[PDB]
Structure formats: structure tokens, C-alpha cells
Design a protein around this motif. Structure first.
Motif, PDB file in Angstrom:
ATOM      1  N   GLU A   1     -62.405 -10.674 -17.558  1.00 38.08           N
ATOM      2  CA  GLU A   1     -61.440 -10.556 -16.472  1.00 38.08           C
ATOM      3  C   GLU A   1     -62.097  -9.920 -15.250  1.00 38.08           C
ATOM      4  OE1 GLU A   1     -59.898  -7.834 -14.914  1.00 38.08           O
ATOM      5  OE2 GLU A   1     -58.586  -9.134 -13.728  1.00 38.08           O
ATOM      6  N   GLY A   2     -62.396  -8.628 -15.349  1.00 36.32           N
ATOM      7  CA  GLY A   2     -63.042  -7.906 -14.270  1.00 36.32           C
ATOM      8  C   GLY A   2     -63.492  -6.532 -14.720  1.00 36.32           C
ATOM      9  N   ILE A   3     -64.728  -6.152 -14.386  1.00 35.77           N
ATOM     10  CA  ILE A   3     -65.349  -4.942 -14.913  1.00 35.77           C
ATOM     11  C   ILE A   3     -65.823  -4.014 -13.797  1.00 35.77           C
ATOM     12  CG2 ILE A   3     -67.626  -6.041 -15.172  1.00 35.77           C
ATOM     13  CD1 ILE A   3     -67.901  -4.253 -17.747  1.00 35.77           C
ATOM     14  N   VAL A   4     -66.680  -4.513 -12.904  1.00 38.34           N
ATOM     15  CA  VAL A   4     -67.332  -3.647 -11.927  1.00 38.34           C
ATOM     16  C   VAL A   4     -67.759  -4.481 -10.730  1.00 38.34           C
ATOM     17  CG1 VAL A   4     -69.667  -3.875 -12.870  1.00 38.34           C
ATOM     18  CG2 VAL A   4     -69.014  -1.794 -11.637  1.00 38.34           C
ATOM     19  N   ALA A   5     -67.677  -3.878  -9.544  1.00 34.89           N
ATOM     20  CA  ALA A   5     -68.175  -4.469  -8.310  1.00 34.89           C
ATOM     21  C   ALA A   5     -69.564  -3.966  -7.940  1.00 34.89           C
ATOM     22  CB  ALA A   5     -67.208  -4.180  -7.156  1.00 34.89           C
ATOM     23  N   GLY A   6     -69.809  -2.662  -8.057  1.00 36.70           N
ATOM     24  CA  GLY A   6     -71.108  -2.095  -7.750  1.00 36.70           C
ATOM     25  C   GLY A   6     -71.069  -1.133  -6.580  1.00 36.70           C
ATOM     26  N   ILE A   7     -71.687  -1.528  -5.466  1.00 32.19           N
ATOM     27  CA  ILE A   7     -71.674  -0.771  -4.215  1.00 32.19           C
ATOM     28  C   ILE A   7     -71.992   0.703  -4.449  1.00 32.19           C
ATOM     29  CG2 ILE A   7     -69.944  -2.400  -3.393  1.00 32.19           C
ATOM     30  CD1 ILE A   7     -67.928  -0.087  -3.407  1.00 32.19           C
ATOM     31  N   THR A   8     -72.716   1.007  -5.524  1.00 26.82           N
ATOM     32  CA  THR A   8     -73.055   2.395  -5.819  1.00 26.82           C
ATOM     33  C   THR A   8     -74.198   2.882  -4.930  1.00 26.82           C
ATOM     34  OG1 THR A   8     -74.615   1.853  -7.607  1.00 26.82           O
ATOM     35  CG2 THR A   8     -72.285   2.077  -8.185  1.00 26.82           C
ATOM     36  N   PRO A   9     -75.223   2.066  -4.652  1.00 28.91           N
ATOM     37  CA  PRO A   9     -76.303   2.572  -3.791  1.00 28.91           C
ATOM     38  C   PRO A   9     -75.889   2.702  -2.337  1.00 28.91           C
ATOM     39  CG  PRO A   9     -76.973   0.641  -5.103  1.00 28.91           C
ATOM     40  CD  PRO A   9     -75.488   0.676  -5.054  1.00 28.91           C
ATOM     41  N   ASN A  10     -75.136   1.731  -1.818  1.00 23.31           N
ATOM     42  CA  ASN A  10     -74.811   1.723  -0.396  1.00 23.31           C
ATOM     43  C   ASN A  10     -73.984   2.942  -0.009  1.00 23.31           C
ATOM     44  OD1 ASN A  10     -74.291   1.002   2.265  1.00 23.31           O
ATOM     45  ND2 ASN A  10     -72.583  -0.346   1.704  1.00 23.31           N
ATOM     46  N   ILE A  11     -72.757   3.034  -0.531  1.00 29.23           N
ATOM     47  CA  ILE A  11     -71.826   4.057  -0.065  1.00 29.23           C
ATOM     48  C   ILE A  11     -72.367   5.451  -0.346  1.00 29.23           C
ATOM     49  CG2 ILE A  11     -69.522   5.017  -0.398  1.00 29.23           C
ATOM     50  CD1 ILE A  11     -68.703   2.037  -1.098  1.00 29.23           C
ATOM     51  N   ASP A  12     -72.897   5.673  -1.549  1.00 25.61           N
ATOM     52  CA  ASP A  12     -73.366   7.007  -1.908  1.00 25.61           C
ATOM     53  C   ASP A  12     -74.450   7.483  -0.951  1.00 25.61           C
ATOM     54  OD1 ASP A  12     -71.639   7.463  -4.005  1.00 25.61           O
ATOM     55  OD2 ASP A  12     -73.019   6.724  -5.544  1.00 25.61           O
ATOM     56  N   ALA A  13     -75.299   6.566  -0.490  1.00 25.38           N
ATOM     57  CA  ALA A  13     -76.419   6.889   0.382  1.00 25.38           C
ATOM     58  C   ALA A  13     -76.128   6.596   1.852  1.00 25.38           C
ATOM     59  CB  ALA A  13     -77.659   6.121  -0.074  1.00 25.38           C
ATOM     60  N   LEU A  14     -74.926   6.124   2.168  1.00 25.98           N
ATOM     61  CA  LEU A  14     -74.624   5.651   3.510  1.00 25.98           C
ATOM     62  C   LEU A  14     -74.460   6.833   4.471  1.00 25.98           C
ATOM     63  CD1 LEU A  14     -72.434   2.614   4.347  1.00 25.98           C
ATOM     64  CD2 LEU A  14     -71.941   4.736   5.543  1.00 25.98           C
ATOM     65  N   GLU A  15     -74.207   6.509   5.740  1.00 22.83           N
ATOM     66  CA  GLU A  15     -74.028   7.504   6.790  1.00 22.83           C
ATOM     67  C   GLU A  15     -72.716   8.251   6.593  1.00 22.83           C
ATOM     68  OE1 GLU A  15     -74.238   5.814  10.676  1.00 22.83           O
ATOM     69  OE2 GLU A  15     -74.091   7.735  11.727  1.00 22.83           O
TER      70      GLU A  15
END
Length: 113
Positions: A1-15
Motif C-alpha cells: 500500500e504505502g510505507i515511506v517517502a524518504g526526504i530524510t537527507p534533504n529536510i534534515d540538512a536543509l536551510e
């Protein structure tokens, strides 16, 4: 169905003056999306997967550090400056300690340990 999108490196390290945004939910998976009812709607549920995110989760869920570089210049009298930190966690972030190095003569009044 649906588990994970990700976006862990971007937002955590973002401005972001914060970090670890929407992180607690990752381990808190749960999930009961599957299932449809008929309130005489029409019932058209296809795929139902994960993708992308807000993409603008900026500045969420941790401390702040407003002062980055102080231009004290020439100090001749007793100066007072403000230091503030904003915690957006749903639970407190306790400071381990303030290791004062070469900071003798600098004191905070009206605050506990």
C-alpha cells in the motif's frame, strides 16, 4: 500500500534553523488505510501509495540559534545581550551542560542550572 517517502537527507540538512522535522513519525508507522465504505459516494480508490511530501517542512521540531557571530568590538563597560533558543519538539530538549572555556566573567542571571 504505502510505507515511506524518504526526504530524510534533504529536510534534515536543509536551510533550517531547526532539524529532525517529522522524524518521530518515521518509526511510528502503524497504518490502517486499506478499506472502503459506501456512503453512496462512488468509491474510486486506486494505487493509494506514498510520494513526495510537503517539500516545505522547514524550521520544524528542534532548538534555534539566532546569534551566529557577535561583533563586540571594543568593550569598556558592562554590556548586556540577549540569547534565546526556541524548542519546537513536543518533548523538551534538555541541555547537557554549558562547558565554559575562557568565558570567565560571563554570567547569566535569573536562570537555573
Amino acid at each position: 500500500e504505502g510505507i515511506v517517502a524518504g526526504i530524510t537527507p534533504n529536510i534534515d540538512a536543509l536551510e533550517l534553523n531547526q532539524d529532525i522535522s517529522l522524524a518521530a513519525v518515521a518509526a511510528s508507522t502503524w497504518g490502517g488505510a486499506y478499506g472502503a465504505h459506501q456512503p453512496v459516494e462512488v468509491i474510486h480508490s486506486t494505487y493509494q501509495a506514498v510520494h513526495q511530501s510537503a517539500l516545505e517542512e522547514n524550521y520544524y521540531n528542534r532548538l534555534w540559534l539566532i546569534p551566529t557571530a557577535m561583533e563586540l568590538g571594543n568593550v569598556v563597560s558592562t554590556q548586556i545581550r540577549p540569547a534565546s533558543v526556541w524548542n519546537a519538539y513536543f518533548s523538551p530538549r534538555t541541555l547537557t551542560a554549558i562547558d565554559r572555556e575562557a568565558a570567565d566573567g560571563i554570567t547569566l542571571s535569573g536562570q537555573a542550572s
